[PDB]
Ligand binder design. Structure first.
Ligand SMILES: Nc1ncnc2c1ncn2[C@@H]1O[C@H](COP(=O)(O)OP(=O)(O)O)[C@@H](O)[C@H]1O
Lengths: 79, 103
């Protein structure tokens, strides 16, 4: 169950964090799951402070890296 | 100053409050800050210097005020600056870059 939709970054509401959280909750559902990242535009930060004001996307990337691997559990299975 | 509360009520002079720490690169600095936060007598929030140095003129300075406006709104806080070298202006006066604005 790959992402397949990272380009759908956000609405005008700052729901992107909730969206990515739901993505990883769907990940935790069907625990043996591997998430493929298209790695296009939701991976924006080249320098972390110069691309597109570091706005919505900077929060998205911060959340993504924060939750990417919290050493949760082996049984989690999220690759 | 907090534990010995009654005496410090009599203090007629502003309490020493700021401390700075050099160190050979990364010899335990954020972890120390984290622990001194977790003593929990004070709340903690922190900024990492390269995060806020936007190219945009306004945000570059507005992001500093973003911290204080929240800190003053809650409680005594640490307001730790990591990577503070990157904010510091290297005593620059001629170029008058955005760094001068921020400092
Ligand atoms: N005395 C120590 N005890 C435990 N960990 C330490 C100690 N000294 C350094 N470290 C480790 O080094 C890092 C200290 O944080 P920091 O100095 O901010 O690293 P950096 O500057 O590279 O971000 C952490 O990864 C911490 O685990």
């Amino acid at each position: 169950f790959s992402v397949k939709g990272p380009e759908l970054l956000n609405m005008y509401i700052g729901e992107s964090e909730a969206n990515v959280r739901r993505v990883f909750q769907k990940a935790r559902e069907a625990k043996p799951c591997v998430i493929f990242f298209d790695q296009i535009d939701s991976v924006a930060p080249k320098r972390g402070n110069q691309g597109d004001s570091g706005g919505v996307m900077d929060r998205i990337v911060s959340q993504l890296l924060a939750e990417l691997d919290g050493m949760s559990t082996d049984a989690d299975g999220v690759f | 100053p907090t534990k010995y509360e009654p005496i410090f009520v009599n203090c007629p002079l502003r309490l020493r409050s700021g401390i700075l720490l050099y160190g050979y690169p990364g010899c335990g600095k954020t972890l120390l800050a984290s622990a001194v936060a977790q003593q929990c007598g004070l709340n903690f929030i922190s900024v990492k210097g390269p995060e806020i140095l936007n190219k945009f003129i306004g945000a570059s300075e507005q992001n500093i005020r973003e911290l204080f406006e929240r800190a003053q709104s809650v409680k005594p806080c640490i307001l730790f600056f990591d990577e503070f070298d990157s904010i510091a202006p290297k005593r620059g006066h001629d170029s008058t870059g955005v760094t001068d604005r921020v400092v």
